[PDB]
Design brief:
The structure is cut from a larger assembly and holds eight copies of chain A (239 residues). Chain A has three domains: 90 residues, mini-chromosome maintenance (MCM) complex, chain A, domain 1 (2-Layer Sandwich); 100 residues, OB fold (Dihydrolipoamide Acetyltransferase, E2P); 49 residues, Rubrerythrin, domain 2 (Single Sheet). In chain A, strand 9 and strand 10 form a beta hairpin. Helices cover 21% and strands 34% of the residues of chain A. The first copy, chain A, starts with a helix and ends with a strand. The first copy, chain A, is globular, with a radius of gyration of 19 Å. With 239 residues, chain A is an alpha+beta fold. In chain A, the strands form two sheets. In chain A, strands 3-7-8-10-9 form a five-stranded mixed β-barrel. The interface between A and B is medium-sized, with 17 and 14 residues. Bound molecules: zinc ion (8 copies). One zinc ion binds next to loops of chain H. The site of one zinc ion (ZN) has 8 residues of chain B, from loops. The PDB classes it as replication. The entry lists the keywords replication. The entry is titled "the dodecamer structure of MCM from archaeal M. thermoautotrophicum". Chains A and 7 copies are DNA replication initiator (Cdc21/Cdc54).
């Protein structure tokens, strides 16, 4: 919960002459950008402790980072930019994406195979509390709706989702096959699912040799009660 | 604006000479008409701000244009007329009907591919409150019944649908394929579902080159858990 | 609820010398008849307002009609005859049986195709109130049992169906294909389901060119949550 | 429940030339009369079986009697007259008013002692069902409110009394001391409570030698869980 | 024995010549009698074992002697007769009416001191089951209403007493003082309460030297929480 | 009439020249006035039917005269003014204030005997719904708080009174004795309670010969269970 | 009649010389017999009205004929004997076994086509009341367990079936095809299911030309929701 | 809720050279002072709008005032001083302390009569939520404990008071009799209760001619459901 300190670090970070500009000129083109790039190196340089936390707790850090930009933004109300990081020094071979990397910032190189259709998902679900009829919004991260814990106003524990009041976002999946030039006879290359959202959607194509950076997440499949790991894409570049 | 501010704006557009008569002739012919066509351009002339809301919140705006007409006719004959706008500048290509356009008024060109059977659907569902046995009517917009939030009379939260007291309405589904003259090799055209209801039913047929204007809606496919977009047709025109 | 007046109109109607007889001579052959025919014309003539209500609210009118016969019948206890109407001036083409005709008296011409097996259904379901163990009978119109709203004696809302105390009735379905001599190349004739009950059972045969008269009802199919219209047969004649 | 037959007997009874008049001329002076007198003898004569039932079930009979007058009264809506009987041949000594006479028509002679103040009571209590908020009226006979058994509309069993919607009536009590000219040395005369309502209120005075006619009722006193008998006055005359 | 074995034994005692007629004359005079006196000695002659149970379990025995008479009369006129035994050998002195005698048939001599007013009490309370609204009658033995255990029809456990449908019965209280000719200096006589009901009401008066025969019952005094013994009079005789 | 029909009638009486100004001057001086006196006679002139309702249903009528004034003032300053009628023909002698007059507008003469201390009472009670924590205000007319029927927002039925948010109002009690010049020997005058509130507080004193005009209300005395009548003062005048 | 009136009638038929011995010989051989055959004709002779009920309400009648025998045997050895009637005049052709015959005693001729495996079924299910843990036995007639309505001892409504304490019974299914000598071209014979239980098990085989006598029962086919008729065999005979 | 602005005004107010000192030198002697005096005039001068709000909403203002001092206090943790105001220009005669002054800052002159004993009360009650066992503190203002609305952590609505964890405060009451030198023959001077808490305790003595300043509060007495006004003392000075 001391991540409040992290917010501060980013607040300052987003004050350095160099960054302060790309931020503004980005908030300029809204909503034709949504993203602000960040060279991992500048972060490494300016405060190497934070640069480490990004790797251990991507989600939290990336949240605090976005929070800062919202604060240091007068004039243009709202505006939520996704901040993507480039040059992550934590490249990891596909085959090694096991449990230790669950929920960690990762960079994986490979070749894009199958690319699924682009479809929406709810990012901000709005619920109606069945206890007092009040409305509560809850940010979703998966395609599985997550109801509020309890209603703080009346103590209710039962909610009804109001789709017409919820906000959507574009989502897409693809297969990231590992590079062959490292295998050794007989071995049929392995692959992992990558999830691209918002503006990283419709960015990659079957064949693209790339380096996907992002958070390694996991999900248990229905029926086959087994988990499966996938990468929640943050930044992407060609090799 | 708020909804109320809009109703007014509309009550005047529907009072202007040019449309004053069209409205009465329709209210007159009911139910041999149901529709009342309005030129977008005229809406712009009368007001540029309203002609914009029509695109950002077509649902409420159109629901307002209906309460306006219902507030004009001399005989207060109720009459649920369909306001259909013609000539919409907001023309979006099919492949680009992503999330940003959910809930927005769009206009898409393409070619009617497959046409489905006309079936009815409940538009006004009547429920019996299991708490006090009173009756409540609730307007439905999808083919999925939506029960009332709670019974205002006794506080009940459980209802039973009374089909025999509900009002139906004809609905129809068809696939709209994108224009071929823009695809580039190895590219199979993408199609999208269009929903036609009331008097727009049985209006189009395979081959017809059209410019479907309507609200972009989304719906989660049962068992797949994935959302999919479709167009709720408002106005149709040939090219 | 003012249909009580309708009961009266039929009471009188079933007093005219002409009708008063076929009634009695019908109640004579019980239970080898069950039906009393009614020339729509005599109804049209004697009270043209009622003749109109039949079309708008078949079920209610036909109920009030049957109610009358029960009242104007001393001596032979019970005896419930179905009254069927001939010569309905509301003939409608098969293809046009849309929502406006849901719950309306209709006459449709066509050719009988597939004819299903004759099977029973419950017409009068008897329920045991789980609250006070009392018995309640409820008339069913579909093959889906409909429990009582609530128990008037104790306020119970939960019931158990007692099959052994319920009354059955013969039911049958068939397909009524539209007449071809009106189509126009390429068009594969459409069809609709007809439901024949009680003594209209085993009356039609594949091939019969007929004119089915009855109430247009609708039902949502399981799985495919879509509705489908069908005709609840009242009278039938050959062309 | 066959008391419906009793209603009939009174309907006829209140058709005899002689009575039919005092009824009308009474309904004339409303609301300056409220009472219609009935010579027990005429009742004895015309139908001696009814004349007996009055004695065994005063309340029911007197109800059916009042019901009749309401039926045989066109023109002046409402109007509820109390019918009082004179010349009851069931005179009983005060000291003998034991259990056998509970709920029986009785005539008792004595001298009026203490006379209490005149105060109102609720005759028709209106309740709000806490289940569905509907209103139910219930006739009260004592000064203790009696809630409905259950709500027939929703099955509710809990009610709230709405005083502002209830109707009141004047009530009064007095002591009827037994006649001394029948005692025998040492014996301190006994007494019983008489309850006078509506227009018999403020009719008797301490000292009046009278003959009270009415229904013998009983009530258990709080604290001292013992019952006590009293007379619910119907008719009164001086000796 | 069991209760049944006793009923039989009694059905014969009540069939013997000597008493055969007394029973019929009583059943005949009902309700101008209510009682049927039987000499204990005769009971001994007819059977010594039954004449004993009468003392060990007077309640059940007497309840049996009643079901017997009720099973003899020709007209099955019901008739709740009071069997009263005369000449009981089990004579216990007043001061010795302790616990061993609770529930036993005793006979105590003394002198009627103070006599209380005759009041009624419910003998047969009728309850309305709050579960199914059905009516249940329950015989009461004390002046404290005893609700049914549970409703056999619906399983309900909550009841409402319907006073207007309940049957009353006259009851009376008096103090019985021990015989003075046995006390020894500085000893104030001890008294005990006697309860007289039905036809035994208003039978004794101060001064009367009697030999009260009845069941010894006990009751806890409210607020004191202490039990106290009293005699439930069955038969009275002067000395 | 209905309530609405009355409001109108009043909105005009309060628009007439003669009273147009009195109303504004009062609305002006608020809250240094609160009252607005109106001559009954003038009400008769303006309308004889309304001047009658004032007597049959003073409560609603007066509640209407308030909504009228509240619907006239230019500044919509709310202002809860007290309409007080002067010169009421419906003068009833004290001893005759029985049930027929409960809820009616009366005028009684007598002499102020005893005067009680002025205390406040809640006029507008504010409750917190225990279901959703929302606040509801409810106008009180007695000194007994009356909770809301149910919460319309969530269906709750349980509330908690929030005294610190409720509005108070001064109330006062006094005994009004009947005029002595009409009693006839051995007759002690009868008194009745009068309740004075708002600006009528501390207006009368012992000895004052007055003509209290107000609504006759009744209330059950706790522990006694007996109703008692009292006058809710509207207008006072000296004789 | 009522059930009781019938039991008597039967107790006499089973007392007549001709059958007096058959019954005893059977009760004697139990359980090496179970059945007791009776000629319908004899039933007619003994009584024509009873021989009719047997057809209109075979279930109750047969249940009565069983309670009769159970009320005759000297040793009160219980013995659940099967009464099977021979030579039934009520012979109905297979294709005509519609609703009017549900619950009726019929006799149908045809040819045993397919025979199923003999399996057991619970005839007397024993349940443990989850409320008080008591045991209740309930006779089953179908292969679908039917729980008790409610527990009379404690009012419970929830039960658990105790298979190890329940009694089984052999049951068997076979298809009965209509006689071929009556069909007319292109007509494939219709078959109906027959259920054979107890000693009738493994009695018939393919090819056997028979005249199945039994009760016509109906049952709803799970998942189809459609009823289907079948014959519950009582007596079998070859042709 | 905009009282946050009031907090600010006091924050500034408590920064003026003059006040900033007495604050500090007061926080110096803790806990031997508890109070900081405030000349109403300085408040009147510096910001006359606030000086008015004090009178209308004493409680809120005085709260915001105390809140400020807590904020502008570094170094010495805790320390809650009561701020008392002197020289209130809202002196009001005792007899006029009616409803309009409920919850208003008031100054009343009079002579101290009876002085009650000093006793403690709970100022900060600590409750244990019966739902999750968590602890909640709630400031009390009366001697009647006020439980929390609901538990924000788990939604619980039931609490248990933990006396051993609650904080107490000294409280005292006295009678403030009005000054006689203003009455006029016969009039027996009136009085009102004053409540002195914390350090104003044991400050006044019978006889002291004083001017009590404070908030007028009201409370309904048990039994006698009537309210009574009293003064919650804030500042006191001698005349
Ligand atoms: Zn809530
Ligand atoms: Zn409801
Ligand atoms: Zn029930
Ligand atoms: Zn209700
Ligand atoms: Zn029950
Ligand atoms: Zn609420
Ligand atoms: Zn049980
Ligand atoms: Zn909690």
């Amino acid at each position: 919960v001391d991540k409040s300190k992290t917010l501060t670090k980013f607040e300052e970070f987003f004050s350095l002459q160099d960054y302060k500009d790309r931020v503004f000129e980005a908030i300029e083109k809204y909503p034709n950008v949504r993203s602000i790039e960040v060279d991992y190196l500048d972060l490494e340089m300016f405060d190497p402790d934070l640069a480490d936390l990004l790797i251990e707790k991507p989600d939290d850090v990336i949240r605090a980072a976005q929070q800062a930009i919202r604060n240091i933004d007068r004039l243009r109300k709202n505006v939520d930019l996704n901040i993507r990081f480039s040059g992550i020094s934590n490249v990891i071979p596909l085959r090694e994406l096991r449990s230790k990397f669950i929920g960690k910032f990762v960079a994986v190189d490979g070749i894009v195979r199958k690319t699924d259709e682009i479809r929406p998902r709810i990012v901000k679900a709005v619920f109606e509390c069945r206890g007092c009829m009040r409305h509560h919004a809850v940010t979703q991260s998966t395609n599985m709706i997550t109801e509020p814990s309890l209603c703080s106003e009346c103590g209710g524990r039962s909610f009804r989702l109001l789709q017409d009041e919820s906000e959507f976002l574009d989502t897409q999946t693809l297969k990231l096959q590992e590079p062959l030039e490292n295998l050794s006879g007989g071995e049929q290359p392995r692959q992992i699912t990558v999830v691209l959202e918002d503006d990283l959607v419709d960015t990659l194509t079957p064949g693209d040799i790339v380096r996907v950076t992002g958070t390694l997440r996991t999900v248990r499949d229905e029926r086959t009660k087994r988990f499966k790991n996938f990468i929640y894409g943050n930044y992407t570049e060609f090799l």
